[PDB]
Design a binder for this molecule. Structure first.
Ligand SMILES: [Mg+2]
Ligand SMILES: [Mg+2]
Ligand SMILES: [Mg+2]
Ligand SMILES: [Mg+2]
Ligand SMILES: [Mg+2]
Ligand SMILES: [Mg+2]
Ligand SMILES: [Mg+2]
Ligand SMILES: [Mg+2]
Ligand SMILES: [Mg+2]
Ligand SMILES: [Mg+2]
Ligand SMILES: [Mg+2]
Ligand SMILES: [Mg+2]
Ligand SMILES: [Mg+2]
Ligand SMILES: [Mg+2]
Ligand SMILES: [Mg+2]
Ligand SMILES: [Mg+2]
Ligand SMILES: [Mg+2]
Ligand SMILES: [Mg+2]
Ligand SMILES: [Mg+2]
Ligand SMILES: [Mg+2]
Ligand SMILES: [Mg+2]
Ligand SMILES: [Mg+2]
Ligand SMILES: [Mg+2]
Ligand SMILES: [Mg+2]
Ligand SMILES: [Mg+2]
Ligand SMILES: [Mg+2]
Ligand SMILES: [Mg+2]
Ligand SMILES: [Mg+2]
Ligand SMILES: [Mg+2]
Ligand SMILES: [Mg+2]
Ligand SMILES: [Mg+2]
Ligand SMILES: [Mg+2]
Ligand SMILES: [Mg+2]
Ligand SMILES: [Mg+2]
Ligand SMILES: [Mg+2]
Ligand SMILES: [Mg+2]
Ligand SMILES: [Mg+2]
Ligand SMILES: [Mg+2]
Ligand SMILES: [Mg+2]
Ligand SMILES: [Mg+2]
Ligand SMILES: [Mg+2]
Ligand SMILES: [Mg+2]
Ligand SMILES: [Mg+2]
Ligand SMILES: [Mg+2]
Ligand SMILES: [Mg+2]
Ligand SMILES: [Mg+2]
Ligand SMILES: [Mg+2]
Ligand SMILES: [Mg+2]
Ligand SMILES: [Mg+2]
Ligand SMILES: [Mg+2]
Ligand SMILES: [Mg+2]
Ligand SMILES: [Mg+2]
Ligand SMILES: [Mg+2]
Ligand SMILES: [Mg+2]
Ligand SMILES: [Mg+2]
Ligand SMILES: [Mg+2]
Ligand SMILES: [Mg+2]
Ligand SMILES: [Mg+2]
Ligand SMILES: [Mg+2]
Ligand SMILES: [Mg+2]
Ligand SMILES: [Mg+2]
Ligand SMILES: [Mg+2]
Ligand SMILES: [Mg+2]
Ligand SMILES: [Mg+2]
Ligand SMILES: [Mg+2]
Ligand SMILES: [Mg+2]
Ligand SMILES: [Mg+2]
Ligand SMILES: [Mg+2]
Ligand SMILES: [Mg+2]
Ligand SMILES: [Mg+2]
Ligand SMILES: [Mg+2]
Ligand SMILES: [Mg+2]
Ligand SMILES: [Mg+2]
Ligand SMILES: [Mg+2]
Ligand SMILES: [Mg+2]
Ligand SMILES: [Mg+2]
Ligand SMILES: [Mg+2]
Ligand SMILES: [Mg+2]
Ligand SMILES: [Mg+2]
Ligand SMILES: [Mg+2]
Ligand SMILES: [Mg+2]
Ligand SMILES: [Mg+2]
Ligand SMILES: [Mg+2]
Ligand SMILES: [Mg+2]
Ligand SMILES: [Mg+2]
Ligand SMILES: [Mg+2]
Ligand SMILES: [Mg+2]
Ligand SMILES: [Mg+2]
Ligand SMILES: [Mg+2]
Ligand SMILES: [Mg+2]
Lengths: 122, 129
RNA sequence: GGGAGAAGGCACGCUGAUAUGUAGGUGAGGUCCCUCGCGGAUGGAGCUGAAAUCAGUCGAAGAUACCAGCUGGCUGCAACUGUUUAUUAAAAACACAGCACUGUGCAAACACGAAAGUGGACGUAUACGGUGUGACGCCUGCCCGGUGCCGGAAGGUUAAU
RNA sequence: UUAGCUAGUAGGUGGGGUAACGGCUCACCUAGGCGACGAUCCCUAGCUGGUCUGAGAGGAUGACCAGCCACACUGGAACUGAGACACGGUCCAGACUCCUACGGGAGGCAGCAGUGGGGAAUAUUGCACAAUGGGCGCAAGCCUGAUGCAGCCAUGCCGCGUGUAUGAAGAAGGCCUUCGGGUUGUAAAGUACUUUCAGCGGGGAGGAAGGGAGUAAAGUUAAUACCUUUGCUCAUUGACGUUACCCGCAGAAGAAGCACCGGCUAACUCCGUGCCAGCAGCCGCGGUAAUACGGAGGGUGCAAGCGUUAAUCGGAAUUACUGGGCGUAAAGCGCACGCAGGCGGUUUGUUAAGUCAGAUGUGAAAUCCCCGGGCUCAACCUGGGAACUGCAUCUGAUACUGGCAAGCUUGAGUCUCGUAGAGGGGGGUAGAAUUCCAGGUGUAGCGGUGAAAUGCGUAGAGAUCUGGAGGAAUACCGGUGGCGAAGGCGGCCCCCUGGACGAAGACUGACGCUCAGGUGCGAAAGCGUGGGGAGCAAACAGGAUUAGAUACCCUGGUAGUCCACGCCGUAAACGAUGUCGACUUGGAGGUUGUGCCCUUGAGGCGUGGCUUCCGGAGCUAACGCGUUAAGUCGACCGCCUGGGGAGUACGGCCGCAAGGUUAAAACUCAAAUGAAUUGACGGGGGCCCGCACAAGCGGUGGAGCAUGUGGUUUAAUUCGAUGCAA
RNA sequence: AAUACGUUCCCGGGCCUUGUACACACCGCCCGUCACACCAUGGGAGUGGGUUGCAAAAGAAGUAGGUAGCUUAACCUUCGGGAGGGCGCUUACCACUUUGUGAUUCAUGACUGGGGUGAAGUCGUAACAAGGUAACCGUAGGGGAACCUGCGGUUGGAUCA
């Protein structure tokens, strides 16, 4: 790494890829759910996480985790995915924006309500 | 081979001081005479002495204080692979004023403090810290 | 090396100019030498003569007639050029260079001939006969029980005498 | 993982053309030009002043604002004109949309609004030329979807408000509790005080300078007309506008949410769950006391915003120029030669290219920054200043570097003379041994392992003596000894030959070092052609052991090993340590010279070269390396950026072939790794014991019974213990 | 009563040392075919789009060059016409369009080479201690698979009384 070696062959920069490639640098892209199905995660956890397999707006086909405690999602219904890797489901990188545009919020949740789309209680 | 006589001189000073020599010796030259003159002026050697008619040996008598070395660190700046020519505002100030930096200016070889008081840059040969 | 003339496309007549026939070829004179003759140099007259460019013009069509590749893609079989069922079969059959095995020490093995002899060969294991396979690349795996062939002559059976 | 490209192509001469030079365009000629300092080709992209980040060097990026370029449905072409090859012009062709009397016609929002569509996502089919600027006009004036303003949007930045004070019955109520109580909490109620902003009414600047009439003075002028300049009285010209701002009214009224609380990260307890529901930015939570999930109470942080996502930079010294690393963590080409390139000892003289210094031109303004001014403050607007780290020009200086010219001798090399050497290439030859053959003896076993067997043997083997034949390797010397650049090289002799090192001299006089591409050598295995073929021996067969054993072990045994020619170009090609060169305490040996001293006996005092072990400061993550450095440095080259995927695919070059070389991605995990430490473990070692084994006596397991258990059976056969240690 | 010669092995311990890829700590962790599912990746008879090179055909309007024809107000003119112009024809250049043929890139494609992840699946036990045959590197052959064997190399291998 002398300066003659540097001008003969330059110091190559450190480029790297985005971990959410299907969003196309859009913060929320709108997907149509083709499937909604449960999967048990990879060990040492054990549950039945709900992954909705959506076809995005730009032709991409990705599954995406569903948050909250329970849901209402079927197929044929447009939702918004927002990125963010769920650690324990192998090969799922997106969450669904709970509250957005067909997927209503959790039932009777009182705290953290903006993250799950629930109006103020009176 | 001997691709840097000035770094030969500086490495000999650093080695002799870190190995507790008293009178180190090297082959002489005009730039070595000028740099050793700067060091004897500022007080990083006791006295230098160039002996020899056709090809001489320059001898440097090293200083000590309480056993420890006097030159704490000494290094090149403008090595021959990559030379460092510096303008007057972009001059160094090694060790926040304490150490000296030898600059060859148009008016011979002189310490960077004298270079700032004469108002011209040059080439930085060493950072006697 | 090939493929390949791959495919595919353009120009093509006549007339005028360059040039009253060009470049090139041939070389008469004439002049000088000349070891003097069917000798050699500049010398280019005359003769012949492409081919190209520009312009003009004609026809519907300029290689105008006769002569004169159909081309491309995938694949089988065979390496190819060759040869054959004269006279229903020309091939995927036969051969082939190459590979291997085997026989043969020269009065060769082998064949044709009772035999002489001759081919082998006026050659001598890098040669010759026979057999199978059929360029080149990657390769040729297991079995000696059967039938052959080669080595044994210790033993059983064994002919003429 | 694009090495060739270029036919008007590079240049010339002549003609033409252009506002202007020019292959701009032609005729003819020359055969050139571009290219590893990246031509050509592919993909992406408007560029810049700047903006975001960064301490800084940089990285990303080009929204508003400003400059420049390009385009105006797509593809062309020219005209008019000063200026276009023309946004709201012409002509041609095309797709789309629309009208038709079917002959034909028309149109181009990437102008401002707006619509449909796409999208996660981005506004009114608003008022005025009052201001600034533009176009025309002598002007008045007209046009002006530029511009000034209004509407929308928490999109950002900034400012303000939701009261203030008193107030302990520490009220109730919630929540928790060791049932004392704590907490919500001076918080609420209460009593007193204020009215910012929103609402109600009143006053109201400034953005307005101009323009239009008339008059006075002057200038032209034959002219006191006309016109222009200078003043002088008049009504005057605002979309914003219900303006900025000021003043008065009445009342605490009309005005607080979001995220988080296991660590990182400020903030903890109860209840509901029970590997379910779920959270997650990473480490991990959840299996019956969850500070991590859901709810409550409490708190912490931000606040008219709070978060989640996306995107950049930082942290990331995690692409390192400032600012990394290479023995073992990923990383030194297998080794050498060497062109370009990079660097270059020492003395003098010149030049002054690089360097430095002053001045000049310049770096548009805006922004950034420093002082300042204004909008009540801030955001914002704005004056002056440096900066604009640059570029060019002039003028200097001469230390370094460069050029140029002359010198030196230490670096590099040449000669003279030896020494040491398994250095290489070619040809001879020697003995020991193995095998095969042939012959003699002589008899029943040989060979083999852990134990056997297949095999060889009554056709006379193995042992044994003689004569051959053949091929290969060279016992002892032999030693971390030597030589070579690396691979490597091992009996002896000859022929050819390279290199090293030492001594006194002499000589050339920077001729040096490193080296991308390029080339040459490069173990073994492998391939081709042709020989040889004793041993050994993959493949293969048979025998065993085994659960099976396509292995180890045994009996055989073909490639191959070997010789000559080539090809492959790989190895844990290792010192896992690129080359060169300098300097830095020592000891122990070995090897090969050499100087001296009396080699006074197989000594002793030094200097070289080469080489192995211990070790100091230094260094190192530690281990360890340690004058042969992994110490302190310099020159040049190679290489690495998490583990896999993978030194693999594809593509190129090479290869007859096996394959070599160059060499990614998608995905996937939060690790993979190096050194050392404590344990544990070993069919590792050493030492030692124990009824462990040995040496002995007796017993169970066989039979019958007692008793406990596992199973079955049942209405219940209660429950618990279940390796030793039930 | 019997027997103890002794430590060669048998298991369980104790201490030092060494090696380690093991720490619920060898009853440890670990490697590869096979069977099923899923994802991405290459080859794949091909097939369909995008862009683009080449060689060519092509010729609307426009310009520039020429000209038989028709025609014309500005100049000369003897009034005859002359110059010059316009239209028209034509040649040059060039767009749309057309054919042929490559180059690149994307999508898709039965089937397949390998790769990765998965619930107590099947067959083994190759590696880590001398891992029970020391491992490993290269290369070749073989084989259900870890791998085994040949030839050469390395210590990054263990025991040294
Ligand atoms: Mg067929
Ligand atoms: Mg044939
Ligand atoms: Mg034929
Ligand atoms: Mg015939
Ligand atoms: Mg016939
Ligand atoms: Mg015939
Ligand atoms: Mg026939
Ligand atoms: Mg005969
Ligand atoms: Mg045949
Ligand atoms: Mg055949
Ligand atoms: Mg066969
Ligand atoms: Mg037989
Ligand atoms: Mg037989
Ligand atoms: Mg056989
Ligand atoms: Mg026989
Ligand atoms: Mg010209
Ligand atoms: Mg001209
Ligand atoms: Mg930084
Ligand atoms: Mg334009
Ligand atoms: Mg246009
Ligand atoms: Mg014009
Ligand atoms: Mg005009
Ligand atoms: Mg216009
Ligand atoms: Mg328009
Ligand atoms: Mg618009
Ligand atoms: Mg819409
Ligand atoms: Mg929509
Ligand atoms: Mg609207
Ligand atoms: Mg106006
Ligand atoms: Mg108008
Ligand atoms: Mg606002
Ligand atoms: Mg209470
Ligand atoms: Mg008010
Ligand atoms: Mg006003
Ligand atoms: Mg005013
Ligand atoms: Mg929260
Ligand atoms: Mg805390
Ligand atoms: Mg939460
Ligand atoms: Mg539990
Ligand atoms: Mg609980
Ligand atoms: Mg949390
Ligand atoms: Mg950085
Ligand atoms: Mg980051
Ligand atoms: Mg590092
Ligand atoms: Mg390693
Ligand atoms: Mg390594
Ligand atoms: Mg090396
Ligand atoms: Mg070299
Ligand atoms: Mg120099
Ligand atoms: Mg200069
Ligand atoms: Mg500026
Ligand atoms: Mg102020
Ligand atoms: Mg100089
Ligand atoms: Mg001398
Ligand atoms: Mg000399
Ligand atoms: Mg090279
Ligand atoms: Mg070999
Ligand atoms: Mg061979
Ligand atoms: Mg073979
Ligand atoms: Mg052979
Ligand atoms: Mg043999
Ligand atoms: Mg290698
Ligand atoms: Mg080696
Ligand atoms: Mg080694
Ligand atoms: Mg290496
Ligand atoms: Mg260091
Ligand atoms: Mg050491
Ligand atoms: Mg070093
Ligand atoms: Mg190190
Ligand atoms: Mg490869
Ligand atoms: Mg370790
Ligand atoms: Mg016993
Ligand atoms: Mg019993
Ligand atoms: Mg019983
Ligand atoms: Mg019981
Ligand atoms: Mg119980
Ligand atoms: Mg129990
Ligand atoms: Mg003890
Ligand atoms: Mg132990
Ligand atoms: Mg240990
Ligand atoms: Mg571990
Ligand atoms: Mg085990
Ligand atoms: Mg594919
Ligand atoms: Mg035309
Ligand atoms: Mg094992
Ligand atoms: Mg075993
Ligand atoms: Mg083993
Ligand atoms: Mg093994
Ligand atoms: Mg091992
Ligand atoms: Mg085998």
């Amino acid at each position: 790494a002398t300066v003659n070696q540097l001008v003969r062959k330059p110091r190559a920069r450190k480029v790297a890829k985005s971990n959410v490639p299907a969003l196309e640098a859009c913060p929320q892209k709108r997907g149509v759910c083709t499937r909604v199905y449960t999967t048990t995660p990879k060990k040492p956890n054990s549950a039945l996480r709900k992954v909705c397999r959506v076809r995005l707006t730009n032709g991409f086909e990705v599954t995406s985790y569903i948050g909250g405690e329970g849901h209402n999602l079927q197929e044929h219904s447009v939702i918004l995915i927002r990125g963010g890797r769920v650690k324990d489901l192998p090969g799922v990188r997106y969450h669904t924006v709970r509250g957005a545009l067909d997927c209503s919020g959790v039932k009777d949740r009182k705290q953290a309500r903006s993250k799950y789309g629930v109006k103020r209680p009176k | 081979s001997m691709q840097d006589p000035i770094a030969d001189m500086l490495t000999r000073i650093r080695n002799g001081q870190a190995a507790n020599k008293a009178a180190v010796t090297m082959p002489s030259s005009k730039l070595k005479v000028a740099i050793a003159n700067v060091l004897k002026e500022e007080g990083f050697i006791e006295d230098f002495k160039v002996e020899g008619d056709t090809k001489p040996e320059l001898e440097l008598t090293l200083k000590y204080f309480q056993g420890k070395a006097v030159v704490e660190s000494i290094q090149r700046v403008s090595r021959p692979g990559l030379r460092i020519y510096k303008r007057k505002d972009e001059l160094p100030k090694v060790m926040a004023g304490l150490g000296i930096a030898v600059v060859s200016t148009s008016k011979g070889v002189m310490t960077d403090r004298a270079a700032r008081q004469a108002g011209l840059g040059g080439e930085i040969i060493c950072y006697v810290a």
